[PDB]
Structure 1
Amino acid sequence: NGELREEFNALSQEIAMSQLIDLALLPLDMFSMFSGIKSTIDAAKSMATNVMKKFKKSGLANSVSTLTDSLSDAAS
């Protein structure tokens, strides 16, 4: 010993429907999400940690925080 946006958007035309509904019936968890993807032992140590750190700064996080703040403020 980039283009991924276009490729991901183009790949999204051929998925089946019945299997999609079947998978949407079975809930996932923190284990099934990454159990089908190969990982490097050095980086698999911090894989859930990084995605959760980036997710706590997501738009949905701001929306839920604002909703909670407005709900608590409404008790005045």
Structure 2
Amino acid sequence: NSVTVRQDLERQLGELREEFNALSQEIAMSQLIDLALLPLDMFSMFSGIKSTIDAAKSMATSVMKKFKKSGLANSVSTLTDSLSDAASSISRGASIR
């Protein structure tokens, strides 16, 4: 029983980008190419990160709900729609050649 347990502010995404730019280049290349041949599925990718949280309330869902709002997913759906339309009957746009 308190006034409330506030949730502290997190970052400025500019500064988080600068934290990445501080970890620009010191990745090892043999180890990175050995890491990039692994099916680092949801469990493996969200288990080791920071090793401390009580909630665990489906942060894979929490990142997916922001993943399916972006250019990549919209472009995938656009491509599939274009393929299905063009196949079925749809006229090719004058700009499309």
Q: Per the shorter chain, which TM-score range? A: 0.7 to 0.9
After superposition, the CA RMSD in angstroms is 1.6
Larger Rg: 2
Work out the CA distance in 2 between the residues paired with 1:11 and 1:42: 28
- 1:67/1:5 CA distance change after superposition, 3 Å: same
Deviation of residue 40 (structure 1)? 5.3
Show CA shifts across 1:37-69 (max 9, x none): 235554311311110100011211011010001
Q: Please, what TM-score do these two structures have when normalized by structure 1?
A: 0.84
- In structure 2, runs of 5+ residues without a counterpart are 1-13, 88-97
- In structure 1, runs of 5+ residues without a counterpart are none
Structure 1 window deviating more from structure 2 (45-54 vs 13-22): it is 45-54
Aligned residues: 74
Q: 1:1-76 counterparts in 2 under 5 A?
A: 2-38=14-50, 41-75=53-87
User: Which contiguous aligned blocks of 4+ residues in structure 1 show a shift greater than 6 angstroms?
Assistant: none
Indicate the structure with greater helix content: 1
Greater relative contact order (Cα 8 A, min sep 6): structure 1 or 2?
Answer: 1
Show CA shifts across 1:20-53 (max 9, x none): 0001111210111111123555431131111010
**Seq. identity, %:** 99
